[PDB]
Amino acid sequence: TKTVFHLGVTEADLNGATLAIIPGDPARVQKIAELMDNPVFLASHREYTVYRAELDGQSVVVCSTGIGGPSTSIAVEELAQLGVRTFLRVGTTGAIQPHVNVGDMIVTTGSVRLDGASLHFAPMEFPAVPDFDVATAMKAAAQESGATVHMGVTASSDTFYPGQERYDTFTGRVVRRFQGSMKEWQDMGVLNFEMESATLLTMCASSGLKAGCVAGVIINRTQKEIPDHATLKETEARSIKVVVEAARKMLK
Amino acid sequence: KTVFHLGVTEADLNGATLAIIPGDPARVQKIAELMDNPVFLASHREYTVYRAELDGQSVVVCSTGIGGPSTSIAVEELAQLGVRTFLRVGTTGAIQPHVNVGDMIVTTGSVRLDGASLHFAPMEFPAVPDFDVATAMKAAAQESGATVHMGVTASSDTFYPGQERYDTFTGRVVRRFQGSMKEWQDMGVLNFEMESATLLTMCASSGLKAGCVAGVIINRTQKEIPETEARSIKVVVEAARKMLK
Amino acid sequence: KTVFHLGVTEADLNGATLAIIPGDPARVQKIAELMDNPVFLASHREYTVYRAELDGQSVVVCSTGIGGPSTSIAVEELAQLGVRTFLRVGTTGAIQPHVNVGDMIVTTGSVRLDGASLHFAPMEFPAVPDFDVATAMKAAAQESGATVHMGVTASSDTFYPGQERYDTFTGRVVRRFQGSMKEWQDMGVLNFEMESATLLTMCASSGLKAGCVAGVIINRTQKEIPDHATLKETEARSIKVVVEAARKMLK
Amino acid sequence: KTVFHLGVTEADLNGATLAIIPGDPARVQKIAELMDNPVFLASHREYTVYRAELDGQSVVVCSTGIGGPSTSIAVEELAQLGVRTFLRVGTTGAIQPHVNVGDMIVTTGSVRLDGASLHFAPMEFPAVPDFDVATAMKAAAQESGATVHMGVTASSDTFYPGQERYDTFTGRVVRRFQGSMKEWQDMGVLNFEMESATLLTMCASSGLKAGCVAGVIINRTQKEIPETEARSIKVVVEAARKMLK
Amino acid sequence: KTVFHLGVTEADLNGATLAIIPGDPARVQKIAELMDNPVFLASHREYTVYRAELDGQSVVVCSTGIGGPSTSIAVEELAQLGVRTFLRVGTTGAIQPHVNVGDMIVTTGSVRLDGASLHFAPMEFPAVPDFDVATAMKAAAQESGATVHMGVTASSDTFYPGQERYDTFTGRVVRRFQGSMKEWQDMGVLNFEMESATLLTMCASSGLKAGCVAGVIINRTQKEIPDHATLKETEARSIKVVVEAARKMLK
Amino acid sequence: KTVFHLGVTEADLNGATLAIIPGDPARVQKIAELMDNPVFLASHREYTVYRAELDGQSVVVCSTGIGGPSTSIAVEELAQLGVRTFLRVGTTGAIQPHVNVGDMIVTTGSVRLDGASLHFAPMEFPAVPDFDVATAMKAAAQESGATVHMGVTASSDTFYPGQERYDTFTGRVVRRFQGSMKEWQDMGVLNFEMESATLLTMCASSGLKAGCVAGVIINRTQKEIPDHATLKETEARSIKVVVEAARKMLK
Ligand SMILES: Cc1cn([C@H]2C[C@H](O)[C@@H](CO)O2)c(=O)[nH]c1=O
Ligand SMILES: Cc1cn([C@H]2C[C@H](O)[C@@H](CO)O2)c(=O)[nH]c1=O
Ligand SMILES: Cc1cn([C@H]2C[C@H](O)[C@@H](CO)O2)c(=O)[nH]c1=O
Ligand SMILES: Cc1cn([C@H]2C[C@H](O)[C@@H](CO)O2)c(=O)[nH]c1=O
Ligand SMILES: Cc1cn([C@H]2C[C@H](O)[C@@H](CO)O2)c(=O)[nH]c1=O
Numbered sequence A: 001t002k003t004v005f006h007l008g009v010t011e012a013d014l015n016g017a018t019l020a021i022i023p024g025d026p027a028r029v030q031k032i033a034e035l036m037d038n039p040v041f042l043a044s045h046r047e048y049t050v051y052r053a054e055l056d057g058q059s060v061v062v063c064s065t066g067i068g069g070p071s072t073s074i075a076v077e078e079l080a081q082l083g084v085r086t087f088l089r090v091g092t093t094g095a096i097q098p099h100v101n102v103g104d105m106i107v108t109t110g111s112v113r114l115d116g117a118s119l120h121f122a123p124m125e126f127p128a129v130p131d132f133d134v135a136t137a138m139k140a141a142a143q144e145s146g147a148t149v150h151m152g153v154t155a156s157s158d159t160f161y162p163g164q165e166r167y168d169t170f171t172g173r174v175v176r177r178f179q180g181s182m183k184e185w186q187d188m189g190v191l192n193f194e195m196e197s198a199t200l201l202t203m204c205a206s207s208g209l210k211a212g213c214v215a216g217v218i219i220n221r222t223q224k225e226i227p228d229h230a231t232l233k234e235t236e237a238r239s240i241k242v243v244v245e246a247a248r249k250m251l252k
Numbered sequence B, D: 001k002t003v004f005h006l007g008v009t010e011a012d013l014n015g016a017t018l019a020i021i022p023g024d025p026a027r028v029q030k031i032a033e034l035m036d037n038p039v040f041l042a043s044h045r046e047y048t049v050y051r052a053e054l055d056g057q058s059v060v061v062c063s064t065g066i067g068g069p070s071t072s073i074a075v076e077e078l079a080q081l082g083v084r085t086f087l088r089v090g091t092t093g094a095i096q097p098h099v100n101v102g103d104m105i106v107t108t109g110s111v112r113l114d115g116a117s118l119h120f121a122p123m124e125f126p127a128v129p130d131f132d133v134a135t136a137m138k139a140a141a142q143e144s145g146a147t148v149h150m151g152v153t154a155s156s157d158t159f160y161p162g163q164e165r166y167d168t169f170t171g172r173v174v175r176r177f178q179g180s181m182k183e184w185q186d187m188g189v190l191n192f193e194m195e196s197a198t199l200l201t202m203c204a205s206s207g208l209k210a211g212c213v214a215g216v217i218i219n220r221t222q223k224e225i226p227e228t229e230a231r232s233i234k235v236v237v238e239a240a241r242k243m244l245k
Numbered sequence C, E, F: 001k002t003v004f005h006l007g008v009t010e011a012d013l014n015g016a017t018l019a020i021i022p023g024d025p026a027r028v029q030k031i032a033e034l035m036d037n038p039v040f041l042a043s044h045r046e047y048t049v050y051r052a053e054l055d056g057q058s059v060v061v062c063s064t065g066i067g068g069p070s071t072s073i074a075v076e077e078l079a080q081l082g083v084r085t086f087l088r089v090g091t092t093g094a095i096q097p098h099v100n101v102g103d104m105i106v107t108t109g110s111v112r113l114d115g116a117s118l119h120f121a122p123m124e125f126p127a128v129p130d131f132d133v134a135t136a137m138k139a140a141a142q143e144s145g146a147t148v149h150m151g152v153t154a155s156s157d158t159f160y161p162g163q164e165r166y167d168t169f170t171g172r173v174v175r176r177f178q179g180s181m182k183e184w185q186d187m188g189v190l191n192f193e194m195e196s197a198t199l200l201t202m203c204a205s206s207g208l209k210a211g212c213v214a215g216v217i218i219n220r221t222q223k224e225i226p227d228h229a230t231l232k233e234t235e236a237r238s239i240k241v242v243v244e245a246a247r248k249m250l251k
C-alpha cells in the first residue's frame, strides 16, 4: 500500500508488473512504453520517470535509472519492493574494440565492477553476471532486429571520465589505477564501457532478481570517425525495439 | 565549446565560476529564483541547469542526480566550462540521536562509501571540503539561525544497504555493511548521504573548491524512511554569497 | 613445439582446438572413450591427456588436477598448442536446498575465491563463461534429461575453510570465511568447486572460450557422503553432457 | 590510575582537557614555558609531559615521538586522563612549489599513508581535523604574521620511501610509492609528515578534537634532506588559547 | 578414520606424524624408497601416498599436485590422520643471479602470491616455516654438499603470469605482475615456486610444523631449458636431503 | 654526512656494521655497558645512540622509539652509515597460556598489523628475520637458560585497539580488530609488540639482516601479576641475550 520513497509509485500502480525495462534517460521511458500497449505515465521524480504498459496482455514497468549505479540501485530496489523481479537494462555505450561498430549491439555477459554500489550487495569476488534467460532473450531479440550482436564483458565505471580513461578533461589527469586501463580492458577482450551494469547485475544476481543489459553502440573509442546521424537515430530506435522484444521473450 | 551531458556552453554560464549543485532537478529553479534574473539554460537527463546573478555575479545552479557517478559528470563538465567552486546542498539522514530533523550539517570530511571517489584519488586520500567553502557554509548556516553540526558524513553509493536499511526487498545487508550504522554512530559520524565522498574527493584532488551542506530530514535512530529543504537552499545561496570574490 | 608440463606437442593434438578438461586424471579416459578413436597421449603429474574424435574433429581431453594453479598451467599449455575452447566438467557440492544431488549446474559466473584468477585479471573482472559454451552446456545438459541450474558458482582455493567446512583438523575457519556459506546461499550461489574462477577469468581475459558444467555429487545442506550408485549415474551423465556440449561447439 | 606509558595520573593534569602534542620531547618544555606555571610531570621513552596554565586553564604538553604508533599511545592515555582536545604542532616538508620554508600549514585532511589510523577506522573514513581546532590554528597562524596554507597533508608511516626519498641506503622505493610525490602534488597535497593521519583519524572517530599545524622546513621540489620552530610553537599555544573558553 | 581425497586411513599411516610432501606424484616412490619398508598406500588424483620407516618411525610421503589448493587438501587430510610435520621438497626456478642451477634453497618465508593462504590467515600473517624444520633442512642440505641459500621464496598461484613469464599464449602479464620479477629480485627474493605460501601459512596458523626445501632447476636470469644430467643430480640430491631433514626432525 | 635524525656520522660508529636496537632510549646505555668501552654518541628525540666494543668489534646501540615509523628511520639512517645487521630486543606481552613471564620469544615471522612495512614491500611479502640472526638469537636465548619460544609475533601499530585492548577511553575496537586476539591465539601467535613487522619487512627486502628477541613480562591470558624480581631478571636477561646474540653474529 506504501508509496516508495523515490519512485513515488505504489504496488497497485504497477498493475501486477513483474518485469521492468530500465533505461538510463528519463526521456526514453515514454519512448519505450509506447512500443507496448496502453502506456500510462505513473510518476516522475528526480531522474525517475515511471510508466506502465502492457505487453502481450501483461503489465510491464518502464523506469529510468539516471546515470550510475547509485541511482540505478534505488530504482531497482523500490521496484522490487513493489513486486518487480526481472529488470532489463537498455542504454548507450562506447565500444572499445575495433571489431564492434557504431550501431552494433552488445549484450553483457559479465561486467567489470569499476563501480562502488555493486560492493553494497556483494563483495568484489562475486561476478557481475546477468540472468542467463535474460541474456539469452536479449541476444535473440537483438539478432532478430537485424543488428550485429556481441556477447561479452562490459566495463562498468562509476565515472564517465577518468574511469573510462578519458584525458580530455579539466585536469587532464587520470589516477594511477586507471592509467593504461583502456588498453588493459581492450587486451582482455572487454567490449564496451557504460556506467550501470556492474551495480545492476551484481545487485540482482545476489538478490534473487533477474537482470540483463543490452546496449546500442553509439561511439567506438578506437575509431576516429564521427558516427553518422542516421545510424545513431536508427540505433536509438533499434535498442528499444530490441529490449521490448527481449521483455516479450521473458514474459513468455 | 560544448560538453557531453549538461547541454550548456561556457557562454551560457556568463562567466560563472561558482555552481550550486543540488541533487534533485526540481530544486534547481527553486535555488535559482532565490537569486537575481534566473535563466533556464538546459534540462537533459538528471541535469537541469540555470544561471542567476548573485550580487552582480553569475552563478550556475545544476542538478547532479543521485550518486557520485552522475555528480562526477556534472562537476567535470561544469569545470570544463570554467566553474571552480561547487556548493552541494541536499537532504540527509542523521545517525546521531542529538542531530534533529531540521538541523543542518556541514561536512568536514566524508566516509568514502562510494566508488567514484576512487576514480580520482586512492582511498587513503581524504574526502574533505575546501576550507573556505566549509567556513562559508558554516557561517551561512549559523547566520540563518539554524542548528548546525560540523562533522563527518558517511557517503554511500546506495540508499538502502550502504545506509544499513533493512526494510527492503531482500531485508538483508552484505557483510561489509552489517552493523555499519552503529559503527559510524560510534565513530561520531553525523549523517548519511550519497554524493559528498565523490564530490569532495574529486574536487580536493582536482584543484576545485567544494563543500556540502545538508538539511536533516530523518533521524535514523528513529526510523528508516522519511521547512528543511527551503531553509537549506537559502543557506547554500548565502554560502555562495560568502564565496563570491 | 613443446610445453613445460603437459608432455604433449601440437602434432599430438591432431589439430584439436577444443579441450574437455575434467579435474580427475581418471576421468580423462572415460571422457575420451565417449568419442571416436580415443588415444592416450601422455600422463605426467595431474595431467593425463587423451585425444579423440568427435564428428570427425580432434578433441583433446586433459585433466587439470584440483585448483586454479594446476588448471591454469593446463589451459595455458593447451592454448600454446592451439586449443581455443575449454569445456570444464567437474564434481561439485551444491549449497542451495532446491538444487538436488544428481542435478546439473552450468556456471554463469564464478565467485572468485581463488588466487590464480587475479594473475590474469584484477578482482573486478567477471569470472564468466563464454556465452556460446554456456549455451551449449545448458542445451546438452537439458537435452540429456537432467535437471539443470544456471547460476553462480563459488570457486574456492580450498576445499575446507573456503567452503566453510568445520569438520577439520583445527575446526577453525578464518574470519573471511566464517558465515560465508550462508552468505553465498542468501546471494543465490548454487555450488562450490575449486577451478572455475581461475578457468573462467583466465579464458575470458585471454581470448579463449570456456564454460563449466558440473554434476551435483553432494548437497551441503544434506550429507557429505554420497551414495555410490547415485554418484556414478551423475558422473556418467555429466561426461555424456560435456561431450555433447563439445559436439555443439564444433564448427 | 597511572597510564601505562606516560607515567602521569589524572590528578597530575590538574583538570586539563587540552593537550599540545609536539613530536620531539625537547620541544615540550619549550611549549610549556610559553604558558604560565609550567611544571614537569614525567619523562619516559619519547614521552615528556608538562602541565602549564593558559588563561587560568590547565593545559598539558606531551611529546608523541615520531609516527602514528607512538602518537596513538600518547593520545589514548591522555584521553584516559580527561584530555579531549589535541593540538599537534610539528615540522613538515612541503611538496608544492608555492609553499615556502617558514610557511605554516594547517591540515584540513590527511592522506592516510599510515597504519595506525586503520586501527581506529577503516580507510574510507576521513582523516580530518575538528573544524574548531583547524579554524583556531588558521587564525593563530595568520595572527603570527605567518603565511598559512590550508589543505591536504600526506601522512606517512615512513620518512624515507613513503615520502618518496631516494637518497637512501637502497635508493629505491616500493611500487606503491614510486611516483607518489608527483601524484600527491598533482592532487594538490601540500606537505608530508608522519602523524596527522593517525592523530586525526583516531580523534575524529573517538570523540576527541584534534588538529595539526606544521612549519615548513624544506620544500621537496628543491631537495630531499632538511624562526620556523619558534613561531610554530607560539602559533600552537595561541591556537590552544582560542580553543579554551 | 577416512578422508575425502587421499584414500588412506589413519591405520594406513602406522602412527606417522611426519609427511614428506613433494609436488610430483612420481616423486613419491622415489622418496619412499630412500627409507625402510616403503609401501604404496593409494593413488587418487594428484595424490600418491606411500608409507615408509625412518629410524624405526613411520613416515608418510604424499604428493600435493601443483598449487596451494591441492596442497591444502593433502595437508589437511594428512593432519586429520595425525600428521603434524610437513616437509616440502620441490623444484624451483631461482631469480637471483648469485643462486646457481643446482643450488638448494630453504625457504625462510614466502611471498604470498597465492589465494589459498588467505583461506587460513589474512595476508598480514607471515608465510613462515617452523624453525626446527627450516633448521633441519638447512643442515641436511649443507651436509649433502650442496650450496644452500636461506631466504624468501615467491610463491605463485600461476606458473606463467605470476612468475612474469611472457613467452605465453597471450604474451601478456596483468598489471600486478608486470615488473614483478625485478621487484622481487631487488627485494632479495630467491626463487619462485607454487605451494610454499599456502603450505607455510596453513601450517603456521594451524599448529602444524612445515618447511620447504628446493633444488634449483633453472635460473630465470639464464635459461628456461634445464640440462638433463644437472637436473637429475639436483633432483636426486633434493630427495636425499629432505629425507635427512626428516631424520633430523624425528630424532 | 651527519644523518638527519640520529645525529651521528659514519666515523662515529667506528666501523660498526651491527646495531642492537631497543625501543626505549634509556635502555641504550644499559645495553652498551654490557660491552666494552661504551661511548655515548648522541641523543635526539627517541634516538639515543651509543657505541661499544664486543670482542674488539664496534657495535652500535640505538633506540628506535615505539612503532615502525620511528624504527624505520633509525634502521635507515644506521644503514646509510654502514650498519647491516640489526638486533631488536625488547619486552612483549604474550598471548599464549604456555608462554610464561620470563620466557623469551624469538620471532620467526611477524603478522604485519603495521603500516610502515608496506612502505618497503607489499603485504604479501613475509615479515621474516634473517635466518642467521634468528639462529643466533635462539642460541643466545637458550644458552641463557631461559625457556625460548620460536614463533609468530603480531606486530601492531597500536598498543590499544590493534592488540584488542578494551580498557580504553572509548572502550571501542574497530571491526578489523574485534575478536582478533582470539584469532591470533588460535593461529598460534605468541605475542604482540609494535615494531617487528616494520623492522623485519624493511630489512628482509633491503638486504639487511634483522631479527627480534623479546623477554615476556606480561601474559594477556594470565590474571596474576608478575613480581618485581622476575620482571627485573627478565629485563636484564633480555639484553644479556641480545648482546650474546650480537657476539654470535660477529665475523
Ligand atoms: C558513449 C558512452 C556512453 N556511456 C554511457 C554513460 C551515460 O550513461 C550514457 C551517455 O554518455 O552512456 C559511457 O559510459 N561511456 C561512453 O563512452
Ligand atoms: C533522507 C536521506 C537522503 N539521502 C540523500 C541521497 C540522495 O541524494 C537524496 C535522496 O535520497 O538524499 C540519503 O542518502 N539518505 C537519507 O536517509
Ligand atoms: C563435493 C565437492 C567437490 N568439490 C570439488 C573440488 C575438487 O575439484 C573435486 C574433489 O573434491 O570436486 C568441491 O570443491 N566441493 C565439494 O563440496
Ligand atoms: C622535514 C620533514 C619532517 N617530517 C616530520 C616527521 C617527524 O614527525 C618529524 C621528523 O622528521 O617531522 C616529515 O615527515 N617529513 C619531512 O620532510
Ligand atoms: C622451474 C620452476 C618450477 N616451478 C614449480 C612449479 C611446479 O610445481 C613445478 C614444475 O614446474 O615446479 C615453478 O613454480 N617455477 C619454476 O620456474
Ligand SMILES: Cc1cn([C@H]2C[C@H](O)[C@@H](CO)O2)c(=O)[nH]c1=O
Residues within 6 Å of the ligand: F023, F066, F067, F090, F091, F092, F093, F094, F159, F163, F192, F193, F194, F217, F218
Ligand atoms: C606489554 C606489552 C608491550 N608492548 C610493547 C609496546 C612498546 O613498544 C613496549 C611497551 O609497552 O612494549 C606491546 O606491544 N604489547 C604489550 O602487551
Ligand SMILES: [Cl-]
Residues within 6 Å of the ligand: A023, A024, A025, A028, A090, A091, A092
Ligand atoms: Cl538510456
Ligand SMILES: [Cl-]
Residues within 6 Å of the ligand: B022, B023, B024, B027, B089, B090, B091
Ligand atoms: Cl536536492
Ligand SMILES: [Cl-]
Residues within 6 Å of the ligand: B101, B217, B218, B219, B220, B222, B223
Ligand atoms: Cl525522524
Ligand SMILES: [Cl-]
Residues within 6 Å of the ligand: C022, C023, C024, C027, C089, C090, C091
Ligand atoms: Cl572431474
Ligand SMILES: [Cl-]
Residues within 6 Å of the ligand: D022, D023, D024, D027, D089, D090, D091
Ligand atoms: Cl616537534
Ligand SMILES: [Cl-]
Residues within 6 Å of the ligand: D101, D217, D218, D219, D220, D222, D223
Ligand atoms: Cl628547501
Ligand SMILES: [Cl-]
Residues within 6 Å of the ligand: E022, E023, E024, E027, E089, E090, E091
Ligand atoms: Cl616435486
Ligand SMILES: [Cl-]
Residues within 6 Å of the ligand: F022, F023, F024, F027, F089, F090, F091
Ligand atoms: Cl626496549
Ligand SMILES: [Mg+2]
Residues within 6 Å of the ligand: A176, A179, D179
Ligand atoms: Mg602514473
Ligand SMILES: [Mg+2]
Residues within 6 Å of the ligand: B175, B178, C179
Ligand atoms: Mg554477517
Ligand SMILES: [Mg+2]
Residues within 6 Å of the ligand: C097, C098
Ligand atoms: Mg527439494
Ligand SMILES: [Mg+2]
Residues within 6 Å of the ligand: C097, C098, C099, C100, C101
Ligand atoms: Mg531435494
Ligand SMILES: [Mg+2]
Residues within 6 Å of the ligand: E097, E098
Ligand atoms: Mg655467479
Ligand SMILES: [Mg+2]
Residues within 6 Å of the ligand: E097, E098, E099, E100, E101
Ligand atoms: Mg652462477
Ligand SMILES: [Mg+2]
Residues within 6 Å of the ligand: B179, F175, F178
Ligand atoms: Mg563489530
